[PDB]
């Protein structure tokens, strides 16, 4: 709240987690291929919760509220990160620097192909909109505070924090040479993406519950308890 737009940007940039690597060696079918995705998502899940601590205003919230906001938005954040990384690789999702996949490879896992296309479309939208890093880390933090703010009472403070991030985005677009109408239009275009990303998480985590009952490939203990948040 007592942070300038520049301090907000740097804070979100300084808080950024590493991209991490997988254990992929071309030596290979529909299992471990989903397990490497599980292993990778599990490790990124850990960096995420230490990333969240460095998000302004987040640590001010109670521990229960921290557990809540993460349980609802842990997949949205992973997916928007995956999309951000897969931005410069059209038609390909960059899960890891050594792990690059496209649509026909996602077909190895049944039903997963539908999620691949959506992830590609979101990256295709980011690339077409020429998204920037400073804009990304804001959206990354916006999802964290919004995707569970009314699945809960003096924590209306969160909205004030959210409004502070919106001030930051407008400040960024104003520096990119955009007009006031252009700033507003871009702001809308960015926030409407969150509607899609939310939809991907809702469908995406319906697939995770599917791979759960289909005990073909076990998932992480943290990932299971994380999955036991939308199923309840």
């Amino acid at each position: 709240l007592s942070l300038t737009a520049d301090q907000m940007v740097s804070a979100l940039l300084d808080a950024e987690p590493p991209i991490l690597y997988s254990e992929y060696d071309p030596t290979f079918s529909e299992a471990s291929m989903m397990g490497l995705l599980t292993n990778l998502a599990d490790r990124e899940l850990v960096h995420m919760i230490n990333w969240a601590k460095r998000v302004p205003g987040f640590v001010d919230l109670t521990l229960h509220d921290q557990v809540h906001l993460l349980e609802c938005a842990w997949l949205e954040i992973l997916m928007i990160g995956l999309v951000w990384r897969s931005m410069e690789h059209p038609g390909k999702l960059l899960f890891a620097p050594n792990l690059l996949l496209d649509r026909n490879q996602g077909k190895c896992v049944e039903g997963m192909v539908e999620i691949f296309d959506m992830l590609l479309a979101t990256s295709s939208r980011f690339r077409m909109m020429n998204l920037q890093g400073e804009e990304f880390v804001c959206l990354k933090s916006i999802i964290l505070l919004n995707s569970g703010v009314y699945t809960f009472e003096e924590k209306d403070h969160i909205h004030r924090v959210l409004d502070k991030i919106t001030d930051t985005l407008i400040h960024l677009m104003a520096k990119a040479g955009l007009t006031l109408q252009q700033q507003h239009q871009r702001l809308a275009q960015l926030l409407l993406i969150l509607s899609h990303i939310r939809h991907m998480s809702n469908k995406g985590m319906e697939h995770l519950y599917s791979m759960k009952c289909k005990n073909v490939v076990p998932l992480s203990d943290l990932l299971l308890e994380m999955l036991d948040a939308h199923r309840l």
């Binding site: 850990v46 969240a52 521990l63 921290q66 993460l70 203990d221 308890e225 994380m226």
Partner: peptide
């Protein structure tokens, strides 16, 4: 809860 532990790690 695993998540609860880390948030206070």
């Amino acid at each position: 809860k695993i998540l609860h532990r880390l948030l206070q790690d």
